[model samples]
Target: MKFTVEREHLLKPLQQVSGLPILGNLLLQVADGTLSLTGTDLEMEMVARVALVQPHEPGATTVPARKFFDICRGLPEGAEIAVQLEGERMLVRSGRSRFSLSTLPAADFPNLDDWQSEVEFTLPQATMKRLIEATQFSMAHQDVRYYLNGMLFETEGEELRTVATDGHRLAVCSMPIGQSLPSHSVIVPRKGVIELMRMLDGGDNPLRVQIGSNNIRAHVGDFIFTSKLVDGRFPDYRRVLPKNPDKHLEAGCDLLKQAFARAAILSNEKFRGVRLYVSENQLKITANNPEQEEAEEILDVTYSGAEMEIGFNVSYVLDVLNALKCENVRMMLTDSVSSVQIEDAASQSAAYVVMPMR
Candidate 1:
């Protein structure tokens, strides 16, 4: 297939999709006068519009994406370009510059057709964007345990639930999309989610999503983002969540984080531990490092629970505190080993459930 478009249109998307090609691979194909730019590293694939030349004929070919980008970088800006096919190769020329590329069999490229088409959801771009920034931090990377390396899309009512965990900490958030559909659950691979986040255009526009049996599609203007679905089942997070966690306290949000930050610097390097000693009128943060160095910070609290000591990765706690910017924050704890659930007094837009470190 081949098509023609202006040089300006091809430049933007080519730069974005190819920016990460140094970490992966890319392909160029011309069809019906239009050039389809595709990039992938097996973990994620992004295809976008690239404006071609005036009256360019249809042709398809594959070349080292790195080499093609370098050649384009030196070409004159907005210069008219044309490409045609020879014996199993592509002849691309723009103004006075020329490049020849060997072609690959198109059939070898994976097909991303939708197989499961029954479910649909429409989420505003802003809402989805918030969820990405809120929880993407907690996703694990390149660990022996595989499932923990992704994000969970928990479904409920008109909200699209997003959650990420790396065994140490979990980030969860949701937004009301102003519309609702059938209930379901899915975990988008971490790579796909990252690429999807970048593809989103920041406008007041709403995007439609179609969830298929083994594929998911994102409809954004003239282009479609199709992705393969992960096959593993998400952990039953409900059973793992604690019940009737009795201890609760609210303290200055920024101050609490600072306390954790200071404590973290001195915390045990081996254990990576920070201790919170809770009382009726005050909450104390204490850290002891492997070398016996110590740090202590105290904050006012309206709590009266049985005094308890809970250990946590300082960075994880700090991450949540930094995100839900409230003058006061609340945490519910049952004991030192139980999961502590955090949220704001204003709304339940997000929750951070963290497992105790020790």
Candidate 2:
């Protein structure tokens, strides 16, 4: 395939989709007056397309994605890049610079098998971005409970929700779409969730998403992204959420965040535990290390319940605090042994549940 494209246009997409050996290369195809660059790693694939310069030759080949991306990125801004396929090698030329890259047959690239969509919907990029960002941190990493190593995307009625958990902590965030949709749930593995988030611009642009029994596809701007879904049932997040705890502690979000940050420095390096001593209208946070080093912080809170003390991983609490963008945060708990429910005082769209560190 031979075509000319602007450096900036090709660079952005290359950076987004470039990775894996044969999977390490990007498939370059020129057809229908457009140039497409595709990269995949068996589990997921991304295809980015740009309008081809006039008088372009149409064909297809695969070239090292990283090297090509680096070459494009190094070229002067707005410089036109010309690419051509000659025998078994691909030629890249820009201005006075030129390089020959090895090529693999484009037909050798594997693609997700054709599948019919069971459900499809369109959502604002911003809404989808927020839902993932609010809960991504809680997804389990390389856990044996394979299903928890991903984020659950569920749609019912007019609401689309994202849920993630690592057994110890859970995050759930939801947003309302203007249209009603059939109820469906899909588990997008951790890598896919992160790659999809990177493609979002957090704007009001529409993102068309298609869900199949074993795969999920998204059309974002000039790129198409697809990933194989994790084939396991996700835990019922609704059942995991706490219901009407007896004690409610409301405190400044920033105040708690800073306090937790400081206490985390002295908490047990292995356990990262912090104790919250709660009373009528005050909350005391304390942490101690094996060396006997300790940190304590007191903050005023809105509480009128029996005094209680709860232990939790400082990092978990800090994550919830950082995810929340509100003036105040509320923590609902029944006892020190039970998991605590946390959320922004001003909104209920996102909620967090962190199990106590016994």
Candidate 3:
């Protein structure tokens, strides 16, 4: 294919989707005067349509993705890039820059097509980005329970929810989008969720989402993202949320997070546990290491109920607190042995559950 385009415009998409040889070739094609770039790792796929100076030929080929990206990135930002085919090689030419690179036949590139029995809906970019931000931190990394290594996307009626858990904690965030959808659930693998989140621009642009039996597709601007859904069942996160919490404590989210951060310094490096002593209108956080170093912080709290002492992983509490944006955070407790729930004082839809440590 032959096309001339701005260097920055082409470079950004290339950097987002392209990968190594084992992931397969990066395909470039021109059809009906548009340049389309596509790449796949056999698990996730990205396709981007690019602008081109017209009156060009239409063709297709596959080449090493990273090498092509490197070539484009090394060129001047203002340089105009021209690409064409010569025998089994692709000619990349810019002002005083020329490289004839070997290419694989376009037919060899795999196209993951045929999304059948799909359930489709649309969401604004900001909502999509927020859903991820609120829960992605809780996804498990390299967990033996493979299903925990992804974020769960569920749709029912007019609500779209994202849930993530790492066995120790769970985060559930939902938004009412007024889109009626069949009750469906999909476990989006960690890599897919990461790439999808990266593509979200937090603009007014709406994304069309489609869910199939084995795949999920999202259309954002000129790019299409497809990912293979995990073939395992995610745990029922609803049951993990504490119910009928009797004790409530309200404190500044920033203050609580900073207190946890300070307390972390003396927490056991391996366990990362901290003790919380909760009394009427007062809370104290304490941590100590095997080396006898101790960290203690006390803050006045707006609370009245059963006095309680609890232990938890400081990192887990800090993560949920930091993700929330609120002047006051409300923590609900049942007892020292049960899960503790945390949420923004003004919002009840998004909640976090952190189980106590012995």
Candidate 4:
């Protein structure tokens, strides 16, 4: 098969679909006046179509994703990139630059499951992006309890919620999609969450989300994203979410974030511990390390609860505040030993649960 495409047009999608080292090889297919490119590591896959400048015979082959992309990337702008099958090798040429790459058997490349989605839904790209951004940080890395290594997606009726936790803290963000649907939950591994985040462009375009028993697929424009669901049950996040915290404090989101950022500089490098002392109308944040250096910051807040002190990892609070776009944030606590609930005041934009540090 032979087809020609613009170097610029080919590079954008190529940047997204590189296979993992040693195991990933990009697949290119041409047939019936269409050409497509796909990359996968077996667990997650990204596929995008190439807009051909010209088309010839129809066939398929696999090539090293990085090498193919690099060759086109270094060529001059406006170069017409051409690919033609020559026996078992694929020939790539742009301008005077030419290279022949030995092809891997395209038939050996794996494909994501092709089952139909049991539940199909659409969400605004921005809303899906927000759901991920609000919780992705809390997903655990290298955890022995493998379920914690991913984010949980739960949908019931009109509400779609994403929950993530790494044992020390949890983040839950729910958004309404205005659709009545059956109850379904899926655990998507960390790699899938990251690729989905990267695919979202913060646009208003509608992203179609399709969930099956063991696979999830997203149709974003011309690109198709698919990932295998983690086959483990996630912790019951609803039970872990704090409830009925009587003490509440409201502060400017930016101000509170800045205070924590400043105090974090002097926090213990290993433990990252910070102490909070809340009093009437005033909140004091203090941190110290083994070297005996301490940093303290105080801010005026809307609070009149009894004097209380709580210790936390400070970083957790910063993560939640930074994910929010509201000017004001509310923090509620039952006492020093309970999980802190943080939320945006103007809307139900996000919810966060930060467990206190002992």
Which of the numbered candidates is closest to the native, going by highest lDDT?
2
TM-score, per-candidate, Cα-based: 0.85, 0.97, 0.96, 0.94
Per-residue lDDT of model 3, residues 43-63, tens digit only: 889999887764678999998
Tens digits of lDDT, candidate 1, 194-281: 7668767897667788877666667665445666667676666565556878898777788888889988999876666898888886
Candidates' lDDT values, in order? 0.73, 0.91, 0.89, 0.86
How do these models rank on lDDT, best leading? 2, 3, 4, 1
Q: Give lDDT for model 3.
A: 0.89
Model 3: number of clashes?
A: 0
Q: Can you write out model 4's per-residue Cα lDDT over 81-179, one digit (the tens) per residue?
A: 888989888999877889998788788777766777799899889888889988998899899988899999999779889999998888888899988
Cα lDDT for residue 9, model 3?
83
Question: Can you give the lDDT of residue 25 in candidate 1?
Answer: 39
Worst 10 residues of 2 by lDDT: 15-24
Q: Report the candidate with higher TM-score, 1 versus 4.
A: 4
Q: RMSD per prediction, one decimal?
A: 3.4, 1.3, 1.5, 1.9
Per-residue CA lDDT of candidate 2, range 109-156, in tens? 888788898888998898988899899999998999999999999998
Q: Which of the numbered candidates is closest to the native, going by highest TM-score?
A: 2
The TM-score, computed over Cα atoms with residue i paired to residue i, of candidate 3 is: 0.96
Instruction: Give the least accurate 10-residue stretch of model 1, judged by summed lDDT.
Output: 19-28
- Name model 2 segments beyond 4 Å from true: none
Rank by TM-score, highest first.
2, 3, 4, 1
